[PDB]
Structure 1
Amino acid sequence: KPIEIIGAPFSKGQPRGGVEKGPAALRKAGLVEKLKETEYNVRDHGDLAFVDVPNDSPFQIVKNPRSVGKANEQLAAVVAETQKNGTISVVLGGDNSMAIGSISGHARVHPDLCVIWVDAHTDINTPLTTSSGNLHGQPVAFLLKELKGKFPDVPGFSWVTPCISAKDIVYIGLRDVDPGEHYIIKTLGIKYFSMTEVDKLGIGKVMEETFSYLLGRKKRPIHLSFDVDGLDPVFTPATGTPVVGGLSYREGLYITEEIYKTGLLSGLDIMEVNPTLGKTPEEVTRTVNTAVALTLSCFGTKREGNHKPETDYL
C-alpha cells in the first residue's frame, strides 16, 4: 500500500512549547527522502494549519480544551480522508494529544483496529484524575468505550466517539504511571508490559505475546502509536518527560521490525519530539535520528540488510 505523511505541528497539550517543531526537525533530517527509497509509495501531505481558539478558558483544570479538541477534529478528518483512499497514515507530532484525532480518523474506516502503545506513560488520566490540566496525559481516556461517561464533557470533544475497548490496546514500556492511571488499567484489565515485564520476558516474548493477544483468532489492522519517551533518555533525550531506565535503541528497532513482519501496520504516530529541549545540538540529532530509524524500520528496513528482488547482484 502507499504511505501519506501528515505533520501535526501542535503543542497545546502541555506547557512546554517546542514540540510543534517535531515534524520540521524530522523532515529536515531526511525522513521522506529515506522513506522513498523503500518498497513503498510515499506522498508528503504537508503540515496542518492550526489556529488558536479565542478566550480558550480552562475547563476546571484542563488547559486549552477547545484548541486541542478543534485541532484533533481537523486531524481526524484529514486522517480518515487519507485512510479512505487505502493509504497508511503516518502522523508526526506534536504532543501526545494528537493521538486522539489519529485513532479516531483511523477507526472511522477500520472499526476493527487495535492499538500498540510504546511509551513510558499510559496517558490514561481523565479530567478528574489529572493533577495537571495538560491534555497530552489524557488521550487514551477520550478513546476507551469503558470510560465513556466516567468524566464530564470537555468543551471541544463533542465530536469524539469511544472507538476502542480496553480489550484492544497493549502498552509496552511503562515506567511512570500515576495512581489514578494504574487504577484504571487494573480495573479495566488493560494488557501491558511495563519495564519489569520486559526485563522478565525479553523483547522477543513481549512481541510474541502482544501479537497472539490481539491477532490470536481474528487478524485486524494495527495502529502503532509511538511516544519517543518510551526509549531510554540516553537515546532520545529531546522530549518533555524523560524517565530513566527505558527501552534501548535495539529494543525499539525490534518492536517496529516485528510489526513490519505481520504486514498489518495501518497507522502510525511519532509523538513528543521536542527539538528545543536538547541540552546540546547533538542531543537533538540523536533523538530525531532514532525517530527516523524507527519509522524506516516499520516500513521494511531490517538490520540483517535489504536488497531489491528481481536483481541478480552477482
Structure 2
Amino acid sequence: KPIEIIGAPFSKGQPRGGVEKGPAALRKAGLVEKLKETEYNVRDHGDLAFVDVPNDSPFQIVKNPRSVGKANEQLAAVVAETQKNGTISVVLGGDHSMAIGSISGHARVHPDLCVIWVDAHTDINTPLTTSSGNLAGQPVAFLLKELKGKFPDVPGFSWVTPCISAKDIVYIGLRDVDPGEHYIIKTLGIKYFSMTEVDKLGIGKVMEETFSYLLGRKKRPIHLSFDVDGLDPVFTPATGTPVVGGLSYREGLYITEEIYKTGLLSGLDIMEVNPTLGKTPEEVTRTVNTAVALTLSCFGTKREGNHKPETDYL
C-alpha cells in the first residue's frame, strides 16, 4: 500500500504562532526517510501553500473564519485526491482546525469511515459556545451531522458538509473539556474514554472497546486524528495547550500499534506540534521524536521488533 505525506503549515486556527513550523520540524527529524524503511511506498506531496484572505474580519467571536475555511477547502481537495487514488493520507499540521479539511476530503472517498480522536480536548465547541474565537477548538462541530444548523453559517465554511455522525467517532485521552463541550458530547451520546476511563480500564481494554464499538458491525476505513497534546506534557511539551495528567509515551504507542494491527488505517493527522513553544531545544526534540515515533508506529514499527519477510538472517 502507498503513503502520501501532506504538509499543512497553518496556524490561524489559534492565537500562538509556531504550529506552521510543525511540518518542517517533522521532516527535519527524518520522518519521510524513516517511513520509506517500512513496508510501505512513500510519496511526499510537499507542503500546501495557503492563500491568506485579506480583511478577514471576525465572525462575531470566531477569528480568521475565511482564512481557515479556505485553507481547509484546499486541503480537503488534496486529500480527496490522494484518497481517490487508493493511497493513505498523512497530514502533518499546524493546528487542529485542519482536521476539518483532512476528514472532509477523506469522507468524500470513504463515506463510511470512523474517526479516532486522540486529544486532551474534545475540540467540539460551536461558534456559539467558544469562549475564544479559536477555530482549532471547533473542528468536530463543523463535521457532525447532529450539529448541523445548531450554529450560524460561518464565512468560508459553506463548502463543508457534515460527513460523520455522533456514532462514528471515539475520543481517547480527554482531560480538558469546556462546560459547553461536555453538554454536547453527553447530549449526542458520543463515545469517549477520558483519562479517568483509561485509568480504570487500562489502555488495553480501552482499545478493545473502541474497536468493538466502531467496527463491531461493519469493518470500515479508520481516520486517526492525533493531537500531540493528548500525551502528557512530559512527552510532548512543545504544544499550544499542554494539560497535565495525559497519556504516556507507552500508551500513545500502544494505541498506534493496535490501529496498525486492524489493517484499516486510511487517514492520519499529526497535529499541534509547535517548535517555537519548547522551553529548551531538548523539549522540542522530545516532542518531535515522539510524534515521529507514533507515525512510524501506525505504519508497522513494533516494539517487539521487525524483520523483513523471506530473508533468512541465519
Same-fold call, TM > 0.5?
yes
Task: Note the alpha carbon deviations across 1:22-78, whole angstroms, 9 max, x for none.
Answer: 000000000000000000000000000012101000000000000000000000000
Quote how far apart the aligned CAs of 1:180 are.
0.2
C-alpha separation in 2, matches of 1:222 and 1:50: 27
* TM-score of the pair, normalised by structure 2: 1.00
Provide, for residues 208-262 of structure 1, a one-character-per-residue CA deviation record: whole Å limited to 9, x for no partner: 0000001101110000000000000000000000000000000000000000000
Provide the rounded CA distance (Å) in 2 between the counterparts of 1:218 and 1:262: 13
Cα distance in 2 for partners of 1:29, 1:178 equals: 34
Share of identical aligned residues, percent? 99
- Secondary structure of 2:27's match? helix
Aligned with 2:148: secondary structure? coil
Distance 1:129 1:279 in 2: 32
In 1, Cα distance between the equivalents of 2:214 and 2:95?
27
Q: TM-score scaled by structure 1? A: 1.00
**Cα-Cα RMSD:** 0.3
Q: Distance in 1 between matches of 2:170 and 2:15?
A: 28
Q: 1:25 maps to what in 2?
A: 25
Structure 1: stretches of 5+ with no match in the other structure: none
Whole-Å separation in 1 of the counterparts to 2:216 and 2:61: 41
- Residue-by-residue CA offset, 1:101-149 (whole Å, 9 max, x unaligned): 0000000000000000000000000000000000000000000000000
1: CA distance between counterparts of 2:139 and 2:14? 12
Match of 2:274 in 1: 274
User: Separation in 1 of the partners of 2:282 and 2:147?
Assistant: 42
> 2:119 maps to which residue?
119
Q: How far, CA to CA, are the matches of 1:97 and 1:169 in structure 2?
A: 17
SS in structure 2 of the partner of residue 252 of structure 1: helix
Partner secondary structure for residue 115 of structure 1 = strand
Quote the Cα distance in structure 2 between the aligned partners of 1:213 and 1:124.
20
Cα deviation digits, residues 253-284 of structure 1 (max 9, x gap): 00000000000000000000000000000000
Structure 2 residue runs of 5 or longer lacking an equivalent are none
Which residue of the partner structure matches residue 66 of structure 2? 66
Q: Distance in 2 between matches of 1:95 and 1:170?
A: 20
Kindly state the Cα deviation for residue 303 of structure 1 after the two structures are TM-superposed. 0.2
Matches of 2:249 and 2:214 in 1, distance apart?
Answer: 25
In 2, Cα distance between equivalents of 1:304 and 1:215: 26
Number of positions where the alignment pairs a residue of Structure 1 with one of Structure 2: 314
2:206 equivalent in structure 1: 206
SS in 2 for 1:146: helix
1:311 equivalent in structure 2: 311
1:260 is the counterpart of 2:260: yes
- d(CA) in 1 for partners of 2:147, 2:208: 29
